[PDB]
Amino acid sequence: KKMSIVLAPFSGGQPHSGVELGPDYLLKQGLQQDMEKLGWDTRLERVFDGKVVEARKASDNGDRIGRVKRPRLTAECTEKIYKCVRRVAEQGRFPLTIGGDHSIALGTVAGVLSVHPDAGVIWVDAHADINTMSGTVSGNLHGCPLSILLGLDRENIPECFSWVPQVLKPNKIAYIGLRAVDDEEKKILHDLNIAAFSMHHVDRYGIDKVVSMAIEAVSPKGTEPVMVSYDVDTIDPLYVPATGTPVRGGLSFREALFLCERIAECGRLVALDVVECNPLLAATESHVNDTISVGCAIARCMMGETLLYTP
Amino acid sequence: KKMSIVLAPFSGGQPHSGVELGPDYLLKQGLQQDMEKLGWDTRLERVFDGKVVEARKASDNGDRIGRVKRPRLTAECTEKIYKCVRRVAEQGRFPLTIGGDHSIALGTVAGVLSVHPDAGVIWVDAHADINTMSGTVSGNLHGCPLSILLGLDRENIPECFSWVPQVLKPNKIAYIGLRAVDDEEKKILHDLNIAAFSMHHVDRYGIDKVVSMAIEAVSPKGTEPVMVSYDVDTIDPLYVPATGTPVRGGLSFREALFLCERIAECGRLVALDVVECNPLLAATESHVNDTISVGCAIARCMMGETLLYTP
Amino acid sequence: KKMSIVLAPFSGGQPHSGVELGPDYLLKQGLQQDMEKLGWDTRLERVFDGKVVEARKASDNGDRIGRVKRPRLTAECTEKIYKCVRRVAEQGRFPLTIGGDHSIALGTVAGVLSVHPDAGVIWVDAHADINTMSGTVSGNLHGCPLSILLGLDRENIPECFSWVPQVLKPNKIAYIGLRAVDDEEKKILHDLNIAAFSMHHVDRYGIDKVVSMAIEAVSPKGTEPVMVSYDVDTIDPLYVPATGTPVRGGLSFREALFLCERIAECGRLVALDVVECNPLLAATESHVNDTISVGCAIARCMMGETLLYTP
Numbered sequence: 056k057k058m059s060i061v062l063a064p065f066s067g068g069q070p071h072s073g074v075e076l077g078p079d080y081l082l083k084q085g086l087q088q089d090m091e092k093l094g095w096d097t098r099l100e101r102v103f104d105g106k107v108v109e110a111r112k113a114s115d116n117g118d119r120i121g122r123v124k125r126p127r128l129t130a131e132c133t134e135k136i137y138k139c140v141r142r143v144a145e146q147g148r149f150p151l152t153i154g155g156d157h158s159i160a161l162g163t164v165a166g167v168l169s170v171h172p173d174a175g176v177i178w179v180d181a182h183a184d185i186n187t188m189s190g191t192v193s194g195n196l197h198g199c200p201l202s203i204l205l206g207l208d209r210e211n212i213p214e215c216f217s218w219v220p221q222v223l224k225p226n227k228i229a230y231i232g233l234r235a236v237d238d239e240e241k242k243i244l245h246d247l248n249i250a251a252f253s254m255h256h257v258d259r260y261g262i263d264k265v266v267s268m269a270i271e272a273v274s275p276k277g278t279e280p281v282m283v284s285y286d287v288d289t290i291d292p293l294y295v296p297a298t299g300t301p302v303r304g305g306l307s308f309r310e311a312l313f314l315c316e317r318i319a320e321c322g323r324l325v326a327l328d329v330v331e332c333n334p335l336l337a338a339t340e341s342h343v344n345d346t347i348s349v350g351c352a353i354a355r356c357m358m359g360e361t362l363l364y365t366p
Numbered sequence: 367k368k369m370s371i372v373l374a375p376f377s378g379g380q381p382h383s384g385v386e387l388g389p390d391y392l393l394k395q396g397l398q399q400d401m402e403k404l405g406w407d408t409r410l411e412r413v414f415d416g417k418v419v420e421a422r423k424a425s426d427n428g429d430r431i432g433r434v435k436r437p438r439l440t441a442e443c444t445e446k447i448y449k450c451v452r453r454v455a456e457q458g459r460f461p462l463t464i465g466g467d468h469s470i471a472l473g474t475v476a477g478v479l480s481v482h483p484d485a486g487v488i489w490v491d492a493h494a495d496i497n498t499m500s501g502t503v504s505g506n507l508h509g510c511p512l513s514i515l516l517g518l519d520r521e522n523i524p525e526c527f528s529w530v531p532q533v534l535k536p537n538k539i540a541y542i543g544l545r546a547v548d549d550e551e552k553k554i555l556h557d558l559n560i561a562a563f564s565m566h567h568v569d570r571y572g573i574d575k576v577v578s579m580a581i582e583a584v585s586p587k588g589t590e591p592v593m594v595s596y597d598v599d600t601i602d603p604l605y606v607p608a609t610g611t612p613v614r615g616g617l618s619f620r621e622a623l624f625l626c627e628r629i630a631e632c633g634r635l636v637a638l639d640v641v642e643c644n645p646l647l648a649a650t651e652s653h654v655n656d657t658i659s660v661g662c663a664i665a666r667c668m669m670g671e672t673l674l675y676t677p
Numbered sequence: 678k679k680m681s682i683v684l685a686p687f688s689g690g691q692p693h694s695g696v697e698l699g700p701d702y703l704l705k706q707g708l709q710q711d712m713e714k715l716g717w718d719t720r721l722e723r724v725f726d727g728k729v730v731e732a733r734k735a736s737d738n739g740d741r742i743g744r745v746k747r748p749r750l751t752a753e754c755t756e757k758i759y760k761c762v763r764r765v766a767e768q769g770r771f772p773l774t775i776g777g778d779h780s781i782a783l784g785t786v787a788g789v790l791s792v793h794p795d796a797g798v799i800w801v802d803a804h805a806d807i808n809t810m811s812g813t814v815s816g817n818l819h820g821c822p823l824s825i826l827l828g829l830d831r832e833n834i835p836e837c838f839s840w841v842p843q844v845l846k847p848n849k850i851a852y853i854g855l856r857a858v859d860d861e862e863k864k865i866l867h868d869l870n871i872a873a874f875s876m877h878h879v880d881r882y883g884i885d886k887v888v889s890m891a892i893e894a895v896s897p898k899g900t901e902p903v904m905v906s907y908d909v910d911t912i913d914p915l916y917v918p919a920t921g922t923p924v925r926g927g928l929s930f931r932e933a934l935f936l937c938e939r940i941a942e943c944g945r946l947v948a949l950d951v952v953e954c955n956p957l958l959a960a961t962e963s964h965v966n967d968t969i970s971v972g973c974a975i976a977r978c979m980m981g982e983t984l985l986y987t988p
């Protein structure tokens with residue numbers, strides 16, 4: 056039971072600064088001691104200085120390739136994450152990656168699947184994050200990592216993303232919590248037949264059935280590794296206010312943590328990202344500790360914490 | 367795919383002014399463009415001037431027949447709605463009626479069932495709206511339209527309501543969301559054996575099962591038209607604050623919209639009312655746009671908007 | 678249909694004053710008239726003066742036996758409750774006990790099971806309330822009544838608790854709503870195999886299935902009496918803010934009352950406690966009437982109030 060907490064304080068996938076403080080706040084709220092208390096021998100992996108990066112992020116408006124913003128900076132930083140996560144996993148440690156915006160998942164998923172090629176990916180998010188380079192409207196790369204990982208619109212992915220291994224297939228991704236899917240992303244999900252469980256499916260079948268279906272969707276042999284990339288904006292703003300792209304009608308706090316328990320319970324979790332905590336994007340101080348404490352709770356539940364006796 | 371958005375800015379079924387602004391606010395939030403964007407060729411039907419009516423409403427306290435308030439004004443305005451909705455439907459257009467208080471449903475239901483006689487009515491509401499003329503305590507006619515439509519307490523319905531066709535039968539109404547049913551209304555629902563799915567049934571079976579049961583209750587052949595009359599106070603005040611008669615423990619925003627998707631999905635929706643949005647009855651500005659935007663969301667979902675690819 | 682509303686304004690099981698005002702506030706919000714209106718011939722049983730007790734509570738810091746705070750005062754007051762509840766039940770009246778903190782359940786459960794020996798106990802609570810004398814960390818006796826009732830850690834229960842009959846067995850308690858169980862309590866629940874339905878089980882199976890399972894767990898012959906001891910902190914602070922030990926991710930207001938309807942519906946309810954309403958522990962006035970009105974609603978629903986026609 057060895058874990059590396061990979062710190063990815065990167066905000067270059069979106070406009071708003073603050074998300075780069077997520078790793079520090081999570082760690083300040085006791086993430087590492089929480090994981091130690093659950094039996095994990097942990098250590099911190101620092102990949103790059105968030106303040107140097109943030110400095111370069113906020114200064115360099117010329118890093119644009121079309122409507123796409125900061126592809127060079129994003130490609131540089133997510134390659135470092137990839138190399139870090141790949142090493143952690145090869146070393147046989149659990150990589151728990153804390154963001155930072157969801158563009159970091161370009162490095163985490165590539166890293167995990169390079170070591171565990173038939174790993175399934177469960178993407179917990181209000182958004183599909185699958186806009187292509189030529190299709191993105193905002194040009195914010197945190198809404199594009201899955202298009203790059205799946206190799207969509209290859210013609211228009213810049214050379215700076217040349218490092219990304221082509222290891223994720225469309226039948227190894229399953230979404231949970233979708234409710235703000237762009238028209239262009241709807242077409243892609245449908246054409247590629249990606250298992251997508253929207254808030255409609257949660258409302259219709261309940262969270263337990265949806266989680267079961269998501270695990271099965273990415274686990275054919277029933278034996279495969281599972282990776283979860285967890286965007287905190289899946290959870291209704293009622294519970295996670297301090298986040299960049301909040302959308303009404305999300306998972307309750309209870310559903311958000313129940314999902315974690317069901318996945319911990321299956322015993323095949325091999326990596327976890329917790330992304331998009333933005334402590335500055337809180338109106339009140341009670342909202343930062345609603346958000347950061349939710350990040351830590353996801354981690355604890357994912358990593359085996361239960362309401363009743365387990366050991 | 368033709369639609370007439372019927373504007374019914376009437377507040378004479380209840381004491382509080384403001385509900386007559388609902389149609390304007392909904393339209394200001396983009397209701398017509400939303401419907402156009404869903405493929406509907408739309409047009410606005412104006413039935414009467416809400417300000418002239420509101421003027422006459424607020425002035426004339428002598429329009430009372432017993433405990434019943436404003437029966438003359440209500441009977442006049444809802445006859446105009448009836449004539450308008452009947453024509454729209456005969457013309458083969460979808461009538462989407464925006465209120466205004468729920469007394470307008472006296473005209474909408476009569477209008478739809480005069481053209482589609484075996485249409486079922488699903489009444490989405492915290493209240494049963496079925497108090498009779500002699501039985502009403504408040505005398506507010508927005509809590510009475512179904513008694514007039516079903517012809518209850520015929521002896522005490524004034525001559526001014528003589529225009530109402532007797533087209534709705536008790537086995538063609540199904541309620542969803544009930545939680546503030548008056549003792550006199552409880553007896554009626556029970557005696558007439560009206561399919562009533564309270565918040566107890568939603569809690570007990572979940573919203574999907576309840577919606578299925580409601581559709582079936584009013585669709586015996588399984589082929590019949592369906593009309594939905596949607597009172598926004600069904601939704602917990604948490605989500606719809608700006609409304610006249612809010613009651614604790616309602617549908618979540620998610621359930622409120624899930625219901626719409628399930629009905630859109632059945633493909634037999636033939637008319638929709640969205641009533642009781644009262645923008646003045648908001649404490650804050652965030653609450654008016656919680657309410658008005660909910661009205662528009664109900665419309666979009668009812669009229670086919672989905673979270674994932676549909677077309 | 679005879680009922681005694683047993684007033685137990687005791688706060689000596691926990692640090693915060695205010696919970697001793699619960700019975701007065703509940704009664705001020707119309708609890709007795711509510712019960713009368715449901716057909717019960719009621720009367721108030723006063724067990725002790727809450728202000729004299731509160732005076733002695735707040736003054737005497739020397740009443741400590743180890744980490745345990747106020748065992749003498751708690752043992753005195755809960756013996757009076759026991760004697761009162763036992764008499765009410767022998768008289769064939771329904772004891773509806775209003776608290777006061779949950780330490781009062783030491784007297785209510787002992788009282789009911791002394792008259793109805795195979796009565797099951799459903800404990801509705803965020804907490805297991807089963808810490809032992811030597812195991813308690815806070816030493817607050819409201820988190821210990823079930824250890825004393827089950828006779829755990831007999832060696833370290835003081836002589837002042839000598840009066841407690843040993844009538845409750847581990848297979849006659851079922852928990853609903855657990856989400857803040859101490860590590861020491863987890864071990865006990867597991868070792869004694871106590872039916873415990875946590876918020877995980879509610880999320881996983883839904884409240885209806887959980888309530889069914891809880892009733893069955895304590896009703897083998899299917900015929901047994903049922904007692905419910907209802908801690909208002911089971912309900913998410915969203916709905917019950919004014920309480921001493923609030924924990925995030927609780928029952929919704931709807932689930933909280935649905936549970937009551939399901940139990941009323943089974944027809945074997947023989948006693949009810951409603952505990953831990955603390956009106957002083959409210960930030961705003963809207964929160965006291967969120968809490969006190971919830972207490973009264975639990976009572977009405979438990980005691981037969983329904984959304985639709987029943988009689």
Ligand SMILES: N[C@](CCCC[B-](O)(O)O)(CCN1CCCCC1)C(=O)O
Binds near residue numbers: 181183193194286299
């Ligand atoms: N789809 C969006 C949102 C991306 C969210 C990224 B995540 O899940 O890590 O927080 C927004 C698209 N946008 C919608 C409104 C109109 C303009 C485009 C985009 O930027 O592509």
Ligand SMILES: N[C@](CCCC[B-](O)(O)O)(CCN1CCCCC1)C(=O)O
Binds near residue numbers: 467494503510
């Ligand atoms: N039942 C009420 C509420 C009507 C709601 C109309 B809707 O659904 O369009 O908003 C209220 C009855 N009232 C209850 C409290 C005591 C006095 C009578 C009535 O006025 O008849």
Ligand SMILES: N[C@](CCCC[B-](O)(O)O)(CCN1CCCCC1)C(=O)O
Binds near residue numbers: 816
């Ligand atoms: N488990 C607690 C809470 C008791 C709640 C009583 B009830 O259900 O009537 O409101 C708290 C234990 N505490 C947890 C935090 C660390 C210190 C010990 C205790 O005091 O034993």
Ligand SMILES: [Mn+2]
Binds near residue numbers: 180286
């Ligand atoms: Mn994302």
Ligand SMILES: [Mn+2]
Binds near residue numbers: 180181182286288300
């Ligand atoms: Mn997102």
Ligand SMILES: [Mn+2]
Binds near residue numbers: 468493508
């Ligand atoms: Mn209504």
Ligand SMILES: [Mn+2]
Binds near residue numbers: 491492597599600611
């Ligand atoms: Mn209503």
Ligand SMILES: [Mn+2]
Binds near residue numbers: 779806819
């Ligand atoms: Mn308790």
Ligand SMILES: [Mn+2]
Binds near residue numbers: 804910911922
């Ligand atoms: Mn408790």
